[PDB]
Amino acid sequence: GDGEAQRDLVKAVAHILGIRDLAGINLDSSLADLGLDSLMGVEVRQILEREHDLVLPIREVRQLTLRKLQEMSSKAGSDTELAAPKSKN
């Protein structure tokens, strides 16, 4: 029901592509460039919507540059209000 543990989305999404280490796989490539059309967006949504209620749709998910998946993995990211849009002036 609730996740006590959470992994990097690289060990999920990249693992769909058969990657994780990216030894010779480019990291500037958009997720759609990688192969996102079907599962590589559904899997993501089904994870994030339940993990952190973070539903980022395909138009945004398509630019998740593989390691960006672990950046928005939602673990230790939202300490207080995710990134907190707060700027003085």
From Swiss-Prot:
Residue ranges annotated for the Carrier domain, each copy included: 1-80
Its annotated function is as follows: Fatty acid synthetase is a multifunctional enzyme that catalyzes the de novo biosynthesis of long-chain saturated fatty acids starting from acetyl-CoA and malonyl-CoA in the presence of NADPH. This multifunctional protein contains 7 catalytic activities and a site for the binding of the prosthetic group 4'-phosphopantetheine of the acyl carrier protein ([ACP]) domain.
Q: How does it assemble?
A: Homodimer which is arranged in a head to tail fashion. Interacts with CEACAM1; this interaction is insulin and phosphorylation-dependent; reduces fatty-acid synthase activity.
Q: Which domain of life is it from?
A: Eukaryota
Its recorded name reads Fatty acid synthase
Q: Which residues carry this modification: O-(pantetheine 4'-phosphoryl)serine?
A: S38
Q: What induces it?
A: Up-regulated in livers of rats fed on a high carbohydrate diet.
Q: What is the lineage of its organism?
A: Eukaryota, Metazoa, Chordata, Craniata, Vertebrata
Q: Which residues carry this modification: Phosphoserine?
A: S38, S78
Post-translational changes noted in the entry:
In adipocytes, S-nitrosylation of Fatty acid synthase occurs under physiological conditions and gradually increases during adipogenesis.
